[PDB]
RNA sequence: CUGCAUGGCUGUCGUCAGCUCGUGUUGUGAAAUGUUGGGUUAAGUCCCGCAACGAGCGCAACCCUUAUCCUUUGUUGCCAG
């Protein structure tokens, strides 16, 4: 058990084969996701996900995407949250050691 | 005396636009990317666009000279009010 929202599609022809084991068929000429053998995936996202937060632990979001790029900064304001929703460019995590840097250089301006 | 032994100095290209690094990326690695591409120039310039983002030196401005004006000042020079 799982609720889904209303499908549609889009680009009828456009699929990965990578996702060949999850993929249930094809219904309004999209292929579609399975929605049961996804389930024990989610209910484990749920719940990892959780145990990271109650350790403190920082949860950063992203949507570079600009379908996604204010839905990643929009769909909370009485919460505090983390986000990157422009062009990653040389780098944000393994380049931590000069992002380190780039927000004092912010901070000075 | 030895620069075919050396710190350097000067000559060459040439005031040419280039040499190199931090971190990310590519490559088995030696190495490359960044520094390319597309507009435009004296110019790795100035922009646009990107697997790059920034940075040191050279480029360039600041700096020196001057056109026309403004402003201060002086002798044994100038002399209007």
Redesign the pocket.
């Known amino acids: 058990m799982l609720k889904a929202g209303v499908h549609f599609g889009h680009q009828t022809r456009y699929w990965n084969p990578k996702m060949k084991p999850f993929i249930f068929g094809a219904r309004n000429k999209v292929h579609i996701i399975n929605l049961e053998k996804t389930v024990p995936m989610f209910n484990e996202a749920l719940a990892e996900l959780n145990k990271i937060a109650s350790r403190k632990g920082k949860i950063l979001f992203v949507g570079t995407k600009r379908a996604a790029s204010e839905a990643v900064k929009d769909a909370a304001l009485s919460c505090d949250q983390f986000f990157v929703n422009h062009?990653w460019?040389?780098?944000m995590l393994?380049?931590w050691?000069?992002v380190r840097q780039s927000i004092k250089r912010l901070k000075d301006l």
């Open positions: 062009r460019l040389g780098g393994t380049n050691k000069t």
